[PDB]
Assembly symmetry: D3
Homo-oligomer: 94 residues x 6
């Protein structure tokens, strides 16, 4: 279950691209992916998610914040009732 998303970015006006990632609350809707040539910071605005990066699972809850380095495969699963929402910022590496 792959995904890009869902970017707000006016490269002439502002430095960072950013947006919101939404995960429907079915453990059907866990999301495998890859950062490619960009660094991402996520911030959990709603939900409980389980993150998998390199060789690590961790649980992230509302208010907690995680980062994906460039060229990394990573996954995110929803672990709660509500849909999960993450604000993110990203930069393509230089």
């Amino acid at each position: 279950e792959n995904f890009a998303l869902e970017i707000m970015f006016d490269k002439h006006k502002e430095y960072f691209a950013s947006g919101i990632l939404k995960l429907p609350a079915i453990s059907g809707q866990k999301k495998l992916s890859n950062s490619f040539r960009t660094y991402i910071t996520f911030h959990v605005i709603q939900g409980i998610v389980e993150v998998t990066v390199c060789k690590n699972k961790f649980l992230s809850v509302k208010g907690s914040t995680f980062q994906i380095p460039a060229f990394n495969e990573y996954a995110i699963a929803n672990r709660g009732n509500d849909e999960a929402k993450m604000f993110f910022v990203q930069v393509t590496v230089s």
Copy 2:
């Protein structure tokens, strides 16, 4: 205000944090970003932003950026304290 910045530079690319504005009026911040680009995301509250010429209200779940070498102000314009998550890069 209350700023706290998290940055373990040997593990992460970005620095991030929470800016809390215990809010009335009060409750408020003046600044200058320096060699720093910042993105703020509003997680609770309604806030008023001044960068450069501009002034806008910015509301829960919205987002704004401050470019390097700009002076900016953030003022709480609501009854509950305002909280923002922010990400930053100190440029070069």
Copy 3:
């Protein structure tokens, strides 16, 4: 009264883009603009200009030097008799 200008840049030979900005001496010929995704340094080689950046006016004369950060609206007015000339260097931000 908007303007780009007027760039010398062989991206395979050299690091910086650069050039010369010329303002005709009519206060008709003041010039609103925006740096977008680039940093500019100006150097007044002839004239007296008034610069407006972010929220600041300043006067610049022959020999004086100013900078525009990226993503900034800025304006330049000629305030003297002669046409005004500025050498500049610029870099698009990373």
Copy 4:
């Protein structure tokens, strides 16, 4: 292991060096790149690499990269000592 890094920052863009693994098993290295991108080129030996999930054998005259903020391991899996030339950039 034996690492030696050459970097005269005022003359060169990159840092480089030789990583020697006096090899049996032994003979081996655990790590984390940090704010550093690394490329390794195998000049003598056969080595086993672990970055992230992956594990591969990497043989004389082959080449592999480690991205910043990844933990990696290199183990000698051959009878002669292994030597790698590497180039790195400490990012920003």
Copy 5:
């Protein structure tokens, strides 16, 4: 020579300055840029530049660049002192 570099790093992206060559022959400079890219603009005088292999005369209102990790020389080849405005970035 007389160099003076202006750089308030918390307010500006670039460093800049004036290089004065009180000129006869004299009057002259040898160097190496290091981790620095430089642009020079000639505001008064005629000067002779050596970067790498090259040698050229460079005249009032003209412009030349020096790449990082190159040795360069600037010599005054005129009767009045030479002055250059320059901009630089110390790379990474």
Copy 6:
């Protein structure tokens, strides 16, 4: 006798471009070139070469390592019997 070469680079997977430069053992096969907007590091895996950069000749043998800064003309001559092989890494400047 000009040359590019011969690059392995999946820009979405990895940070550096890299490869191997091979010089046939005829002093016919010396190779003038230019780094343009990139920094290169070379590593002599086989041979004896003579490098010319900016204003410098130097001899490089097996195991020795040299660098070309961006925007530089440079040449490489084979000085030995065998064909000469150099591993290299490169980055286009920012």
